[PDB]
Amino acid sequence: SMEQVAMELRLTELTRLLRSVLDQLQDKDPARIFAQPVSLKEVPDYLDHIKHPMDFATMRKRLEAQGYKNLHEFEEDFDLIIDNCMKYNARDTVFYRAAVRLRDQGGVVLRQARREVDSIG
């Protein structure tokens, strides 16, 4: 149908905007602490602590398969990255502090993304 196509164009354009958002968020992680899944070879107990692991590479895979239907779903995954870290790692660690800084800096980016998604529809 013509409508399914229109719908698919909207999803493609959302994917386009979310790809830009993801790049901007990932620039706020210059140490690459959040770039890849926590290694279960190196942290074998991790899943006993964290039930829904997340990381930027995993978000990117989902993004490129057009697997985010709306900004809320994307934000959910970004918040997992931060929240998983702040639970597993103590306050006085480079990991926890990195997540606080990513949260604070990403807020600005996400605030305008929400306006852009509402604005462009």
Coordinates of N, CA and C in Angstrom, one line a residue:
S1 N 0.8 -1.2 0.0 CA 0.0 0.0 0.0 C 0.8 1.3 0.0
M2 N 0.2 2.4 -0.4 CA 0.9 3.6 -0.4 C 1.1 4.0 1.1
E3 N 0.2 3.7 2.0 CA 0.3 4.1 3.4 C 1.5 3.4 4.1
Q4 N 1.7 2.1 3.8 CA 2.8 1.3 4.4 C 4.1 1.9 4.0
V5 N 4.2 2.3 2.7 CA 5.4 3.1 2.2 C 5.7 4.4 3.0
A6 N 4.6 5.2 3.1 CA 4.7 6.5 3.8 C 5.2 6.3 5.3
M7 N 4.6 5.2 5.9 CA 5.0 4.8 7.3 C 6.5 4.4 7.3
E8 N 6.9 3.6 6.3 CA 8.3 3.2 6.2 C 9.2 4.4 6.0
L9 N 8.8 5.4 5.2 CA 9.6 6.6 5.0 C 9.8 7.4 6.4
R10 N 8.7 7.5 7.1 CA 8.8 8.1 8.5 C 9.7 7.3 9.4
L11 N 9.7 6.0 9.4 CA 10.6 5.2 10.2 C 12.0 5.4 9.7
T12 N 12.3 5.5 8.4 CA 13.6 5.7 7.9 C 14.1 7.1 8.3
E13 N 13.2 8.0 8.3 CA 13.6 9.4 8.7 C 13.9 9.4 10.2
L14 N 13.1 8.7 11.0 CA 13.4 8.6 12.5 C 14.7 7.9 12.7
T15 N 15.0 6.8 12.0 CA 16.2 6.1 12.1 C 17.3 7.1 11.7
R16 N 17.2 8.0 10.7 CA 18.1 9.0 10.4 C 18.4 9.9 11.5
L17 N 17.4 10.4 12.1 CA 17.5 11.4 13.3 C 18.2 10.6 14.5
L18 N 17.7 9.4 14.8 CA 18.3 8.6 15.9 C 19.7 8.3 15.7
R19 N 20.1 8.1 14.4 CA 21.6 7.8 14.1 C 22.4 9.0 14.5
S20 N 22.0 10.2 14.2 CA 22.6 11.5 14.5 C 22.7 11.6 16.1
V21 N 21.5 11.4 16.8 CA 21.5 11.4 18.2 C 22.5 10.4 18.8
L22 N 22.6 9.2 18.3 CA 23.4 8.2 18.8 C 24.9 8.6 18.7
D23 N 25.2 9.3 17.6 CA 26.6 9.7 17.4 C 26.9 10.8 18.4
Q24 N 26.0 11.7 18.6 CA 26.2 12.8 19.5 C 26.4 12.3 21.0
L25 N 25.6 11.3 21.3 CA 25.7 10.7 22.7 C 27.0 9.9 22.9
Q26 N 27.4 9.2 21.9 CA 28.6 8.4 21.9 C 29.8 9.3 22.0
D27 N 29.8 10.5 21.4 CA 30.9 11.5 21.6 C 31.0 12.0 23.0
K28 N 30.0 11.9 23.8 CA 30.1 12.2 25.2 C 30.7 11.1 26.1
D29 N 31.2 10.1 25.4 CA 31.9 8.9 26.0 C 33.3 8.7 25.3
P30 N 34.1 9.7 25.5 CA 35.4 9.6 24.8 C 36.3 8.5 25.2
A31 N 36.2 8.1 26.5 CA 36.9 6.9 27.0 C 36.4 5.6 26.4
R32 N 35.3 5.6 25.6 CA 34.7 4.3 25.1 C 34.3 3.3 26.2
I33 N 34.0 3.7 27.3 CA 33.6 2.9 28.4 C 32.3 2.1 28.1
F34 N 31.5 2.7 27.2 CA 30.1 2.2 26.9 C 30.0 1.7 25.5
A35 N 31.1 1.6 24.8 CA 31.1 1.3 23.4 C 30.6 -0.1 23.1
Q36 N 31.0 -1.1 24.0 CA 30.7 -2.5 23.7 C 30.1 -3.2 24.9
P37 N 29.4 -4.4 24.7 CA 28.9 -5.1 25.8 C 29.9 -5.4 26.9
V38 N 29.6 -5.3 28.1 CA 30.4 -5.8 29.2 C 30.7 -7.3 28.8
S39 N 32.0 -7.6 28.8 CA 32.5 -9.0 28.5 C 32.2 -10.1 29.6
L40 N 31.5 -11.1 29.2 CA 31.1 -12.2 30.2 C 32.3 -13.1 30.4
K41 N 33.3 -13.0 29.5 CA 34.6 -13.7 29.8 C 35.3 -13.0 31.0
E42 N 35.4 -11.7 30.9 CA 36.0 -10.9 32.0 C 35.2 -10.5 33.2
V43 N 33.9 -10.5 33.1 CA 33.0 -10.3 34.3 C 32.0 -11.4 34.2
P44 N 32.4 -12.6 34.7 CA 31.6 -13.8 34.5 C 30.3 -13.8 35.3
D45 N 30.2 -13.0 36.4 CA 29.0 -12.9 37.2 C 28.0 -11.8 36.8
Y46 N 28.3 -11.2 35.6 CA 27.6 -9.9 35.4 C 26.1 -10.0 35.3
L47 N 25.6 -11.1 34.7 CA 24.2 -11.3 34.5 C 23.5 -11.7 35.8
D48 N 24.2 -12.1 36.9 CA 23.6 -12.2 38.2 C 23.3 -10.8 38.8
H49 N 23.9 -9.8 38.3 CA 23.8 -8.4 38.8 C 22.8 -7.6 37.8
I50 N 23.1 -7.7 36.6 CA 22.4 -6.8 35.5 C 21.6 -7.8 34.6
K51 N 20.3 -7.6 34.7 CA 19.4 -8.4 33.9 C 19.2 -8.0 32.4
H52 N 19.4 -6.7 32.1 CA 19.2 -6.3 30.8 C 20.5 -5.4 30.4
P53 N 21.6 -6.1 30.0 CA 22.8 -5.4 29.6 C 22.5 -4.5 28.4
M54 N 23.3 -3.4 28.2 CA 23.1 -2.6 27.0 C 24.4 -1.9 26.8
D55 N 24.6 -1.4 25.6 CA 25.9 -0.7 25.2 C 25.6 -0.1 23.8
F56 N 26.5 0.8 23.4 CA 26.3 1.6 22.2 C 26.3 0.7 20.9
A57 N 27.2 -0.4 20.9 CA 27.2 -1.2 19.7 C 25.9 -2.0 19.5
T58 N 25.4 -2.4 20.6 CA 24.1 -3.2 20.6 C 23.0 -2.2 20.2
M59 N 23.0 -1.0 20.6 CA 22.0 0.0 20.2 C 22.1 0.3 18.7
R60 N 23.3 0.4 18.2 CA 23.5 0.6 16.8 C 23.0 -0.5 15.9
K61 N 23.2 -1.8 16.3 CA 22.6 -2.9 15.6 C 21.1 -2.8 15.5
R62 N 20.5 -2.5 16.6 CA 19.0 -2.3 16.7 C 18.7 -1.1 15.8
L63 N 19.4 0.0 15.9 CA 19.1 1.1 15.1 C 19.1 0.8 13.5
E64 N 20.1 0.2 13.1 CA 20.3 -0.1 11.7 C 19.4 -1.1 11.1
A65 N 18.8 -2.0 11.9 CA 17.7 -2.8 11.5 C 16.3 -2.0 11.7
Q66 N 16.3 -0.7 11.8 CA 15.1 0.1 12.1 C 14.2 -0.5 13.2
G67 N 14.9 -0.9 14.3 CA 14.3 -1.5 15.4 C 13.8 -0.6 16.5
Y68 N 14.0 0.8 16.4 CA 13.4 1.7 17.3 C 12.1 2.4 16.6
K69 N 11.0 2.1 17.2 CA 9.7 2.6 16.6 C 9.5 4.1 16.9
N70 N 10.0 4.6 18.1 CA 9.8 5.9 18.6 C 11.0 6.3 19.5
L71 N 11.2 7.6 19.7 CA 12.3 8.0 20.6 C 12.3 7.4 22.0
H72 N 11.1 7.2 22.6 CA 11.0 6.6 23.9 C 11.7 5.2 24.0
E73 N 11.6 4.4 23.0 CA 12.3 3.1 23.0 C 13.9 3.2 23.0
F74 N 14.4 4.2 22.2 CA 15.8 4.6 22.1 C 16.2 5.1 23.4
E75 N 15.5 6.0 24.0 CA 15.9 6.5 25.3 C 15.9 5.4 26.4
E76 N 15.0 4.5 26.3 CA 15.0 3.4 27.3 C 16.4 2.6 27.3
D77 N 16.8 2.3 26.1 CA 18.1 1.6 25.9 C 19.3 2.6 26.4
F78 N 19.3 3.9 26.1 CA 20.3 4.7 26.6 C 20.3 4.8 28.1
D79 N 19.2 4.8 28.7 CA 19.1 4.9 30.2 C 19.6 3.5 30.8
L80 N 19.4 2.4 30.1 CA 20.0 1.1 30.6 C 21.5 1.1 30.7
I81 N 22.1 1.8 29.7 CA 23.5 1.9 29.7 C 24.0 2.5 31.0
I82 N 23.4 3.7 31.3 CA 23.7 4.5 32.5 C 23.4 3.8 33.8
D83 N 22.1 3.3 33.8 CA 21.6 2.8 35.0 C 22.3 1.5 35.4
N84 N 22.7 0.6 34.4 CA 23.3 -0.7 34.7 C 24.7 -0.3 35.3
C85 N 25.4 0.7 34.8 CA 26.7 1.1 35.2 C 26.7 1.6 36.6
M86 N 25.7 2.4 37.0 CA 25.6 3.0 38.3 C 25.2 2.0 39.3
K87 N 24.6 0.9 38.9 CA 24.4 -0.1 39.9 C 25.6 -1.1 40.1
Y88 N 26.2 -1.5 39.0 CA 27.3 -2.5 39.1 C 28.5 -1.9 39.7
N89 N 28.8 -0.6 39.4 CA 30.0 0.0 39.8 C 29.8 1.0 41.0
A90 N 30.7 1.0 41.9 CA 30.6 1.9 43.0 C 30.8 3.4 42.6
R91 N 30.3 4.3 43.4 CA 30.4 5.7 43.3 C 31.8 6.3 43.0
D92 N 32.8 5.7 43.7 CA 34.1 6.2 43.5 C 35.0 5.5 42.4
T93 N 34.3 5.1 41.3 CA 35.0 4.4 40.3 C 34.9 5.3 39.0
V94 N 35.9 5.1 38.1 CA 35.9 5.8 36.9 C 34.7 5.4 36.0
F95 N 34.2 4.2 36.1 CA 33.0 3.8 35.4 C 31.8 4.5 35.8
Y96 N 31.5 4.5 37.2 CA 30.3 5.2 37.7 C 30.4 6.7 37.2
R97 N 31.6 7.3 37.4 CA 31.7 8.8 37.1 C 31.4 9.0 35.6
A98 N 31.9 8.0 34.8 CA 31.7 8.2 33.4 C 30.2 8.2 33.0
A99 N 29.5 7.4 33.7 CA 28.0 7.3 33.4 C 27.3 8.5 33.9
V100 N 27.7 9.1 35.0 CA 27.1 10.4 35.5 C 27.3 11.5 34.4
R101 N 28.5 11.6 33.9 CA 28.9 12.6 32.9 C 28.2 12.4 31.6
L102 N 28.0 11.1 31.2 CA 27.2 10.8 30.0 C 25.7 11.1 30.1
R103 N 25.2 10.8 31.3 CA 23.8 11.2 31.6 C 23.6 12.7 31.5
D104 N 24.5 13.4 32.2 CA 24.3 14.9 32.3 C 24.5 15.6 30.9
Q105 N 25.5 15.1 30.2 CA 25.7 15.7 28.8 C 24.7 15.2 27.8
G106 N 24.2 14.0 28.0 CA 23.3 13.5 26.9 C 21.9 14.1 27.0
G107 N 21.6 14.6 28.3 CA 20.3 15.2 28.6 C 20.0 16.3 27.6
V108 N 21.0 17.2 27.3 CA 20.9 18.3 26.4 C 20.5 17.9 25.0
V109 N 21.1 16.8 24.5 CA 21.0 16.2 23.2 C 19.6 15.6 23.1
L110 N 19.2 14.9 24.1 CA 17.9 14.2 24.1 C 16.7 15.2 24.3
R111 N 16.9 16.3 25.0 CA 15.9 17.4 25.1 C 15.6 18.0 23.7
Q112 N 16.6 18.2 22.9 CA 16.3 18.8 21.5 C 15.8 17.7 20.6
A113 N 16.3 16.5 20.7 CA 15.7 15.4 19.9 C 14.3 15.2 20.1
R114 N 13.8 15.3 21.3 CA 12.3 15.2 21.6 C 11.6 16.3 20.8
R115 N 12.1 17.5 20.9 CA 11.5 18.6 20.2 C 11.4 18.4 18.7
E116 N 12.5 17.9 18.1 CA 12.7 17.5 16.7 C 11.7 16.4 16.2
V117 N 11.6 15.4 17.0 CA 10.7 14.3 16.7 C 9.2 14.7 16.8
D118 N 8.8 15.5 17.8 CA 7.5 16.1 17.8 C 7.2 17.1 16.7
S119 N 8.2 18.0 16.5 CA 8.1 19.1 15.5 C 7.9 18.4 14.1
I120 N 8.9 17.7 13.6 CA 8.8 17.0 12.3 C 7.8 15.9 12.2
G121 N 7.2 15.5 13.4 CA 6.1 14.5 13.4 C 6.6 13.1 13.4

